[PDB]
Design a protein around this ligand. Structure first.
Ligand SMILES: CN(C)c1nc2ccc([C@](O)(c3ccncc3)c3cncn3C)cc2c(Cl)c1-c1ccccc1
Length: 223
């Protein structure tokens, strides 16, 4: 409830993000001028569907591990029972990784950083999931227009994970209290930075979960 407590939560959220964000934003930004040549692009397109899914499933799985570390460094999260930790991470972790991808997305030319250089959608053609790739590019383009800071990303992804509506929770009221305090931390932070305007602009509920197709499920077969 307290203002000092709310400030402590904000620093808690931002600290854990800063240590689990995986790639440094200043490196991502420095590399925007480094674009795959047409020859390097064609090299990705000549991958087999399986080879290209093995590569992307490696990335997705790596990124989930970091989101799991992110959650476990939040003080309120380890207080929850382990069942509820599982239910939240299972239902929310892939959605956080998708949000985290907006940092690798350069809205200026509609390219994404991938394995060392920026490339267009055509780079993922060998997945055979054009619709999906397109939908992900359009979602990142939406988030990039908000000019999220690292702190704002940290707080937003916290609210993706800490959702009292996930079915299967056995201490619903605990996660509700946590969700409410995180909403207060988010709103408080945005007021102190005069950035409350973004709340109206956030992607609507459901559209982010709409991203997660079965294309990105059952990835164990890829090793
Ligand atoms: C837009 N889509 C097609 C994607 N973009 C991605 C952009 C970046 C990454 C990174 O993994 C990453 C992850 C987290 N934070 C920073 C970088 C990455 C790139 N270079 C080194 N890394 C670690 C992975 C992406 C993936 Cl897997 C997909 C994707 C691939 C297949 C299906 C769906 C999405």
């Amino acid at each position: 409830a307290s203002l000092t407590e709310i400030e402590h939560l904000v620093q808690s959220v931002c600290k854990s993000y800063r240590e689990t964000c995986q790639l440094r934003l200043e490196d991502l930004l420095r590399q925007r001028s480094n674009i795959f040549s047409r020859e390097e692009v064609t090299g990705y397109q000549r991958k087999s569907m399986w080879e290209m899914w093995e590569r992307c499933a490696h990335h997705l799985t790596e990124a989930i591990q970091y989101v799991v570390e992110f959650a476990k460094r939040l003080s309120g999260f380890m207080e929850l029972c382990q069942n509820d930790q599982i239910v939240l991470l299972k239902a929310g972790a892939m959605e956080v990784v998708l949000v985290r991808m907006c940092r690798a997305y350069n809205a200026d030319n509609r390219t994404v950083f991938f394995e060392g250089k920026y490339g267009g959608m055509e780079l993922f053609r060998a997945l055979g999931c054009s619709e999906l790739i397109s939908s992900i590019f359009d979602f990142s383009h939406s988030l990039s227009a908000l000019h999220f800071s690292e702190d704002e990303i940290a707080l937003y992804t916290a609210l993706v994970l800490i959702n009292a509506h996930r079915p299967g929770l056995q201490e619903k009221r605990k996660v509700e209290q946590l969700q409410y305090n995180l909403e207060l931390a988010f709103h408080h932070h945005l007021c102190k930075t005069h950035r409350q305007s973004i709340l109206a602009k956030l992607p609507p509920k459901g559209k982010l979960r709409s991203l997660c197709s079965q294309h990105v499920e059952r990835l164990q077969i890829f090793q």
